[PDB]
């Protein structure tokens, strides 16, 4: 929901890193839960316990990625004393990518995920700065 997104975004950038990490963990957990729900729906796991294990795996992976991203991004923002800089989000995104690589235990996944997640997080920070809209309201 947008309640979680507002919970994350209401806290300023370089302040209260633990709260921001908690909000990012909530977002990641929700995303992993949705992914596991769709995966179980389309690919049944053949027993209840295997489905529970898969759901726990997916949710834990996504929540860890989100928590690491939020913590690293906030700590970088506060240490460098440079809020409104996409580099902090890039560092957090690559930290999340390396977390995903460690979780799946693959070096190629780790490298590609770090690069792409850092780029995407930096892009999102840029859009927050300049007011880019993904879903533009009809205007003309």
């Amino acid at each position: 929901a947008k309640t979680l997104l507002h919970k994350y975004s209401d806290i300023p950038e370089g302040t209260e890193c633990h709260r921001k990490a908690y909000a990012s963990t909530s977002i990641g957990g929700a995303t992993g839960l949705i992914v596991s729900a769709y995966s179980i729906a389309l690919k049944p796991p053949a027993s209840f316990l295997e489905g529970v294990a898969r759901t726990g795996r997916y949710t834990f992976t996504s929540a860890a990625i989100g928590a690491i991203f939020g913590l690293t991004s906030c700590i970088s923002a506060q240490v460098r004393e440079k809020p409104d800089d996409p580099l902090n989000y890039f560092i957090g995104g690559c930290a999340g990518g390396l977390t995903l690589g460690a979780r799946t235990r693959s070096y190629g996944i780790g490298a590609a995920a770090c690069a792409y997640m850092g780029l995407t997080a930096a892009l999102v920070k840029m859009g927050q700065l300049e007011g880019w809209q993904v879903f533009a309201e009809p205007k003309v």
């Binding site: 840029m126 700065l129 300049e130 880019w132």
Partner: protein, 459 residues
């Protein structure tokens, strides 16, 4: 300029209604006549362009490109009829139709007054090229080459369209004259940075830029001779034309957004020149030489000085002619021995003397021997770069060496040494091939005589 466009549209039904044994003759004659007519576009002014109507106009940068396209069509017609002898009449007419359609699209591309019509035609040139490569290529790899030719281009050009229409909603026009007269500076923001990248990446991939060039060896090696000729001579120059056009609205961002592209271009001309030294394929060597020369052109355009622009235009024209000649020269040997390996047939100066003369002239022109227009463009670019930064003379100097090496290397391996013993099917050169080489080479020296015609609007 409908006086040039309509005769090609009439080339179409003339080709499709000619007798089965007169298609080549009629096509060649009327293409040559159209080239003669298009030669009248060189009467340019020193202040503004020739605005024929609301849709078409000509500058001093596009007129030599149009003349080059019109002159190139008959050359491909002559070089094509050798290996298409066993083909049926309808397929031969379809081949000539593909060439004519490509010429028509390029002619209308080089003279569109609006950026969106330019975009439409500069994508429309993709279809005949893909059909030619994937249908009349020789080896199995052609299919893959076609794919590499297609998406590499489209992945670059689809963002551009977006930017283009976005610009139309903010400035209210895409007409080039209005765009030039109402130009405004670009602020330092992320939105402007991504607009710059979207406007620039299509023409960067078309040149191609180093790191974005993997499609070029495939496309230029797996294509037929006419396909390779038109790919190297004209289609690579669309990126240069487009970038020299579009850079009018990107200042002063380029002042710092050219740095990664300048670095890529310089180190990549070094890398591709070094790659050319170890190449067992004769066509791949020519492809990588094209890459190096286009890297020089990219540097020239990114510097954004008048001398660099003049050098870029001259190098574009000269490289087109030289690369087309080299491809034809390699294709003669391929048609003889049915192999592209460079060390297979050796000592061909002993067996084919006049073709050895053509090889020597083409190799000398490639390595920028003065006073060829290749050298003029290269030297103008080097001087502008030295004004930009004094250390560039290192890297450019390096290139000026390596080029010559591989150039002579090719010559020495294909013409010199002792002939291969077991090859005994090497027939004397036909009149067609000799005329092809002569018609490639003589305009180069004629342009050397009067080089102001190809120095662009900055002259």
């Amino acid at each position: 300029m409908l006086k040039i466009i309509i005769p090609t549209t009439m080339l179409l039904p003339m080709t499709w209604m000619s007798k089965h044994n007169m298609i080549w003759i009629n096509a060649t004659v009327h293409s040559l006549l159209i080239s003669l007519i298009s030669l009248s576009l060189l009467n340019q002014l020193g202040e503004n362009s020739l605005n024929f109507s609301l849709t078409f106009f000509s500058d001093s940068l596009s007129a030599p490109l149009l003349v080059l396209t019109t002159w190139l069509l008959p050359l491909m017609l002559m070089a094509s009829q050798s290996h298409l002898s066993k083909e049926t009449t309808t397929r031969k007419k379809l081949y000539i139709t593909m060439l004519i359609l490509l010429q028509l699209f390029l002619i209308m591309t080089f003279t569109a007054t609006e950026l969106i019509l330019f975009y439409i035609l500069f994508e429309a040139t993709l279809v005949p090229t893909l059909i030619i490569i994937t249908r009349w290529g020789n080896q199995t790899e052609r299919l893959n080459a076609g794919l590499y030719f297609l998406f590499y281009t489209l992945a670059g050009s689809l963002p551009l369209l977006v930017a283009l229409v976005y610009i139309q909603n903010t400035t209210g026009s895409l007409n080039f004259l209005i765009i030039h007269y109402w130009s405004h500076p670009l602020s330092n923001s992320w939105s402007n940075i991504f607009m710059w990248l979207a406007c620039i990446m299509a023409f960067m991939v078309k040149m191609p830029l180093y790191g974005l060039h993997l499609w070029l060896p495939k496309a230029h090696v797996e294509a037929p001779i006419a396909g390779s000729m038109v790919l190297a001579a004209v289609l690579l120059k669309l990126g240069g034309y487009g970038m020299m056009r579009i850079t009018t609205i990107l200042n002063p961002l380029t002042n710092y957004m050219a740095y990664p592209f300048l670095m890529l271009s310089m180190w990549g001309m070094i890398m591709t020149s070094s790659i050319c030294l170890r190449q067992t394929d004769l066509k791949s060597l020519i492809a990588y030489s094209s890459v190096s020369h286009m890297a020089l052109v990219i540097v020239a355009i990114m510097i954004q000085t008048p001398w660099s622009f003049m050098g870029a235009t001259a190098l574009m024209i000269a490289h087109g002619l030289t690369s087309s000649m080299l491809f034809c020269l390699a294709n003669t040997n391929y048609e003889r021995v049915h192999s592209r390996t460079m060390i297979l047939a050796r000592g061909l100066q002993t067996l084919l003397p006049l073709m050895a003369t053509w090889w020597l002239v083409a190799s000398l022109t490639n390595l920028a021997l003065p006073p060829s227009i290749n050298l003029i463009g290269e030297l103008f670019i080097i001087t502008a770069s030295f004004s930009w930064s004094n250390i560039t003379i290192i890297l450019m100097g390096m290139n000026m060496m390596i080029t010559a090496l591989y150039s002579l290397y090719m010559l020495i391996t294909t013409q010199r040494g002792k002939y291969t013993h077991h090859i005994n099917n090497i027939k004397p050169s036909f009149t067609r091939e000799n005329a092809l080489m002569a018609l490639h080479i003589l305009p180069l020296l004629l342009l050397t005589l009067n080089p102001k015609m190809i120095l662009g609007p900055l002259y």
